[PDB]
Amino acid sequence: NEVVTRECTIHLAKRVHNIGFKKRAPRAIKEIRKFAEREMGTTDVRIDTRLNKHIWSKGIRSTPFRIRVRLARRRNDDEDSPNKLYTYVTYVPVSTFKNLQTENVES
Amino acid sequence: MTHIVREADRPGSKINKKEVVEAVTVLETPPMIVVGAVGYIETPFGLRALVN
Amino acid sequence: KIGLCAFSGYKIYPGHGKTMVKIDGKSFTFLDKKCERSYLMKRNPRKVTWTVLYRRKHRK
Amino acid sequence: GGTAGGKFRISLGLPVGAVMNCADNTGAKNLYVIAVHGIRGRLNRLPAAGVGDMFVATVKKGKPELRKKVMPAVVIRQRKPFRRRDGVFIYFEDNAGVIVNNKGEMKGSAITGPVAKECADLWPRIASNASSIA
Amino acid sequence: KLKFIDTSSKMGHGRFQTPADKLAFMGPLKKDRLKEEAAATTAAAAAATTT
RNA sequence: UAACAGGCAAGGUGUUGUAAGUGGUUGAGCAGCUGCCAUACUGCGAUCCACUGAAGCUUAUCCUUUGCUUGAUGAUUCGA
């Protein structure tokens, strides 16, 4: 394998709970990272700038509750780092988060 | 915890034969399996586990 | 045993809420605090759309 | 006196010095808690009264032969919710009490409202003078 | 001798003892209304493309 | 290897208390328009009603589990 692409839905308001407002969330950018570090095992996480534009959509106080992302695992290309595999987290604009099961298949 | 309703059975208090609320606690207790035995002798310094 | 809520129209098992006595003196047994608060706030129980008195002014 | 049986500890809503209403037709329009008739006391703790508590009163609005003078009084209603053994938490719209004698005899002749039921089984002559117990 | 044991819901102010009583007092919701009429209806509507 | 967990999801349970859309004239009225034919629509109108006890949130220290999905490795030391 070593190149997988998952389309998953992270319940963000569960991670960023227990954190004070105005600090929820620049921690979502820190929880998208330690979420793509568990489901993909790689400790390198490149967050798409559109994921930034979406986590910062309702300000520093109000973040989404769910969010549907795509974790794409790829190989380092430019003078490969110590770890070959990195994750790239992209934002998927899903209208309804209901009955949306996690799919492991993605081209 | 869950709170019973019961009717009291105590002579002459002023809740005699009148139905009271109590609180109760719930303890999930699934069976003990006995898995060994220990013996204890008397010493002048205490009790002493002898055999297991 | 089973009181009726004077705001929401709900059955009340033992436990579960208050009994405000007025000095008229009418006794009012409420289900929980949400109801009694909306009574003293003088909301009308035919216009909060979740109670039994609203659910028989209409059917719902 | 009047006690037979045993009253349960309810929540004591009326401390020294609360001004409750007088519901007695004696012409007094106030009571004022000076003390409570069984309180032994603890350091910094105020004596407080609940339903069925005899207390020491003055009158702050009322007839001038009742004003400026210590008298005994029994509390018949209160605003602090209190539990009964039946699980009922019951409270009233007003704190009120009635001017009473030294031996539990009520001073006036009528009570303008309901008397709580924990009051009326201690004091028969307050039970005898009220429309609606509880 | 206990007369009654309150098994109402302790995640809030629970109003009903059994889930039957939540369907005796209240009715069917946009829920078991729809889920009891998305099975017997589709069993005669899955063949509508077939026929 | 996957009798197990983690993430979701579904259901429960709650909590706010009727979503958005669409339809109705629901509606106080309109220095608003409109034919002979007596007529009428509105992108005019707070509000109201229907779909709609809806919709939102619900473990992050809530409950349940055939659903979808993931899970071959570490390191330091220790002898009677």
From Swiss-Prot, chain A:
Example GO molecular function: structural constituent of ribosome
Highest taxon of source: Eukaryota
PROSITE patterns associated with the record: RIBOSOMAL_L31E
GO BP of this protein: cytoplasmic translation
Any GO CC annotation of this UniProt entry: cytosolic ribosome
Positions of modified residues (Phosphotyrosine): Y88
One Pfam family hit: Ribosomal_L31e
Keywords from the named record: Phosphoprotein, Ribonucleoprotein, Ribosomal protein
InterPro entries: Ribosomal_eL31 (IPR000054), Ribosomal_eL31_CS (IPR020052), Ribosomal_eL31_dom_sf (IPR023621)
Keyword Ribonucleoprotein in annotation: yes
Protein family according to the UniProt entry: Belongs to the eukaryotic ribosomal protein eL31 family.
Entry protein name: Large ribosomal subunit protein eL31
Organism (species): Drosophila melanogaster (Fruit fly)
UniProtKB/Swiss-Prot annotation, chain B:
Domain of life from the UniProt record: Eukaryota
Subcellular location: Cytoplasm
Protein's job: The L3 protein is a component of the large subunit of cytoplasmic ribosomes.
Assigned protein family: Belongs to the universal ribosomal protein uL3 family.
Protein name as annotated: Large ribosomal subunit protein uL3
The organism's taxonomic lineage, starting at the top: Eukaryota, Metazoa, Ecdysozoa, Arthropoda, Hexapoda
Annotated gene: RpL3
Parent-record interval covered: 53 to 104 of 416
UniProtKB/Swiss-Prot annotation, chain C:
GO molecular function, one term: mRNA binding
GO BP term, example: cytoplasmic translation
Keyword Ribosomal protein: yes
Keyword Ribosomal protein in annotation: yes
Transmembrane domains' residue ranges: none
UniProt keywords, alphabetically: Ribonucleoprotein, Ribosomal protein
Recorded GO CC terms: cytosolic large ribosomal subunit; cytosolic ribosome
Source superkingdom: Eukaryota
The family this protein is said to belong to: Belongs to the eukaryotic ribosomal protein eL24 family.
Entry protein name: Large ribosomal subunit protein eL24
Species of provenance: Drosophila melanogaster (Fruit fly)
Gene that encodes the chain: RpL24
Residues shown, of full length: 2 to 61 of 155
Curated annotation (Swiss-Prot), chain D:
Family membership: Belongs to the universal ribosomal protein uL14 family.
Pfam family, one: Ribosomal_L14
NCBIfam families listed in its UniProt record: PRK08571.1
Keyword set, alphabetical order: Ribonucleoprotein, Ribosomal protein
Gene Ontology terms: biological process: cytoplasmic translation
Presence of the UniProt keyword Repeat in the record: no
SUPFAM superfamilies on file: Ribosomal protein L14 (SSF50193)
A single cellular component GO annotation: cytosolic ribosome
Protein name: Large ribosomal subunit protein uL14
Alphabetical list of PANTHER family matching this protein: 50S/60S RIBOSOMAL PROTEIN L14/L23 (PTHR11761), LARGE RIBOSOMAL SUBUNIT PROTEIN UL14 (PTHR11761:SF8)
GO terms, molecular function: large ribosomal subunit rRNA binding; myosin binding; structural constituent of ribosome
Domain of life: Eukaryota
